Amino acid sequence: MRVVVIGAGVIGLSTALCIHERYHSPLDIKVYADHFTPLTTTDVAAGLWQPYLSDPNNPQEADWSQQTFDYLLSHVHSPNAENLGLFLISGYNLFHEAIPDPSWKDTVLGFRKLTPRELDMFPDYGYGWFHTSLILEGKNYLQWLTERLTERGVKFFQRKVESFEEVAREGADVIVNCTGVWAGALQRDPLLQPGRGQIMKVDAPWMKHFILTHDPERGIYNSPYIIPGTQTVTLGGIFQLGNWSELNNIQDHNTIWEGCCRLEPTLKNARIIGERTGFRPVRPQIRLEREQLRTGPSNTEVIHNYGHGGYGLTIHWGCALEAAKLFGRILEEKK
Amino acid sequence: MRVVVIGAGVIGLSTALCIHERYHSVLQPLDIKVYADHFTPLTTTDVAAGLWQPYLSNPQEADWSQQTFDYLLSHVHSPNAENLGLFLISGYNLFHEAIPDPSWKDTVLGFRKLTPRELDMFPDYGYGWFHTSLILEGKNYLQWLTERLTERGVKFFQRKVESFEEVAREGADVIVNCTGVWAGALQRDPLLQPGRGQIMKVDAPWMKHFILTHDPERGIYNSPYIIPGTQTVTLGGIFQLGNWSELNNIQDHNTIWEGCCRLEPTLKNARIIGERTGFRPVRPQIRLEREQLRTGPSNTEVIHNYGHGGYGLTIHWGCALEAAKLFGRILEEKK
Ligand SMILES: Cc1cc2nc3c(=O)[nH]c(=O)nc-3n(C[C@H](O)[C@H](O)[C@H](O)COP(=O)(O)OP(=O)(O)OC[C@H]3O[C@@H](n4cnc5c(N)ncnc54)[C@H](O)[C@@H]3O)c2cc1C
Ligand SMILES: Cc1cc2nc3c(=O)[nH]c(=O)nc-3n(C[C@H](O)[C@H](O)[C@H](O)COP(=O)(O)OP(=O)(O)OC[C@H]3O[C@@H](n4cnc5c(N)ncnc54)[C@H](O)[C@@H]3O)c2cc1C
Ligand code: NA
Secondary structure: OEEEEEOOOHHHHHHHHHHHHHHOOOOEEEEEEOOOOOOOHHHHOOOEOOOOOOOOOOOHHHHHHHHHHHHHHOOOOOOOOOOOOEEEEEEEEEEOOOOOOOOOOOOOEEEEEOOHHHHOOOOOOOEEEEEEEEEEOHHHHHHHHHHHHHOOOOEEEEOOOOOHHHHHHOOOOEEEEOOHHHHHHOOOOOOOEEEEEEEEEEEOOOOOOEEEEOOOOOOOOOOOEEEEOOOOEEEEOOOEEOOOOOOOOHHHHHHHHHHHHHHOHHHHHOEEEEEEEEEEEEOOOOEEEEEEOOOOOOOOEEEEEEOOOOOHHHHHHHHHHHHHHHHHHHHHHHO | OEEEEEOOOHHHHHHHHHHHHHHOOOOOOOEEEEEEOOOOOOOHHHHOOOEOOOOOOOOHHHHHHHHHHHHHHOOOOOOOHHHHOEEEEEEEEEEOOOOOOOHHHHOOEEEEEOOHHHHOOOOOOOEEEEEEEEEEOHHHHHHHHHHHHHHOOOEEEEOOOOOHHHHHHOOOOEEEEOOHHHHHHOOOOOOOEEEEEEEEEEEOOOOOOEEEEEOOOOOOOOOOEEEEOOOOEEEEOOOEEOOOOOOOOHHHHHHHHHHHHHHOHHHHHOEEEEEEEEEEEEOOOOEEEEEEOOOOOOOOEEEEEEOOOOOHHHHHHHHHHHHHHHHHHHHHHOO
């Protein structure tokens, strides 16, 4: 059974790992990707576990997000959780209005509304939440997934796939399409578009909480947020639909710094370390489904797993579990 | 009006500040001087991680603690918060059995019980709390107070005071005794005793919460605790009555490290940065009262402000205000 996983981001590596630990013994797993850690969108993410506020169009995604939290919760107190870049963090979600509770309110730990004395610390906001969640930094998690894969016999190849057929010609029986925001290059998807994001990494070691603000009229993550990592603090708040510019933007740089300093004036004493741009694979819902390749002399099974938007880290494991369930359905039908 | 404050820890400097801001105008001149054998970072105040949390049990002590928190909380987003060494932090208080709520439950931010899913992360404990408090790092706060004092004309002097009388003979009208655990060298106090504590400073920046454990089998502050500072994380849990050893010892280092690693297994990847020993000024209650000096030819009143145990940072401001009131009493009896 010969399988090719395209994509070395959090989605491709976790799917390759998750499929391997369920369906090996003898599985031939190969990972094709043209960029690896540190040069993926997964490495640009702060890694805060938090799905979108509104309910997902696919209610299964709330299940996938809950399965990812429980899986990461089973790692947090293991002695090597820092090798995963995983740790607990509590923080604030700030609003100008009483947004309804999110679907993940019982998934995170200790979800509650903010008290007036807490809201008095943020004069520009009149409502919000407090809860405890997790951070999973891509740079560490992708490296962890890699050696978990390599020590299992999984081989990696740096190469740009031009088409599913080219891989099908080489004899792949299953193609796992985990190409993120670039899935349209292999199969047109007018529902897939980039959510361009720019972030800033600063040295602010006194920041122990995440702080996320929301103006839903401006769009999700078009409002300042502050997310402490393991080494530095991530400043952000830019979500640009349809923008493919990978270069850092000067107005976006000012927008991040302005907004975050207004939110947390202590950041005026912070040292800027770096600045990065990434593309969220935006889709009305995640494409997680099986598909027959209707092109070429062979019918090759494709498991799609892309379009995770701004919550790929948040949801990757449940999606990997679902893709593994589809792989098994293929393995049974092929007999 | 000559005043000599003995001690440059949090009690002496805050008392000297409170006395000046309250009686500077009505007394021209008000000559305040601070005598101290040692200054930050060589005071007991500098060994403390600086977490605000009073004892778990004199009912004025609850008020002085709450006054301190409200005064510190009003500075959280101020431009000087980094100069003060102040920042917010949430964390866990863990118990082996159910315990009633503390008196200060409404002073901190978002106090609540731990949920079953949270308590599952700490198998050694079946009950606990979660809330948001403050850390005031003495290494910064003592420098901040010193600067506020010097700009108000308060002069500092490095000297070991041998007796109250030596300072009285030099013309001091009021002596504020803020000598902490060493107050007994100036006047025998069989109620004051050293509470020796050894701590560990480690580089574990993924730790965003404090964790305090409570073990009646081991004693108060003799159970592991984890308190993240700005640059390092304090590992502690040592309370030894009557031990005057100022050196770190290996057995106490092991007790802390093993205890904290059992509580938080990720610490096995932390770099130990440093290790300090301090002596809590243990007393059944704070000595905060006036006394006429019955030694030497001079008419000098002593204001005692010592014996704050393991909560001096937590309570320092309320005590400083009360000491300023006692100073006002002395002024009223001089007329
Ligand atoms: C600024 C920003 C902040 C974010 N913060 C968070 C956060 O806090 N929490 C969260 O959960 N999510 C967050 N996200 C979202 C998260 O980054 C993504 O949802 C997630 O990384 C998507 O993973 P992926 O593997 O599908 O995409 P990618 O990580 O981009 O992986 C795509 C992979 O496919 C490969 N590939 C693509 N096309 C081809 C081809 N033709 N041939 C070969 N290889 C190919 C690429 O080389 C790459 O290895 C953030 C995103 C941005 C932009
Ligand atoms: C390990 C540890 C952890 C702690 N953690 C916390 C915590 O998280 N939160 C909290 O609120 N509290 C904490 N504490 C308690 C806190 O450190 C003390 O209660 C507080 O620092 C006492 O303040 P002080 O100014 O009286 O003593 P000090 O800070 O020791 O100041 C005494 C001063 O008097 C001077 N002095 C003494 N004798 C003389 C003399 N004869 N002549 C001249 N100068 C003299 C000294 O040189 C020094 O300047 C902790 C204590 C320890 C040991
Ligand atoms: Na438990």
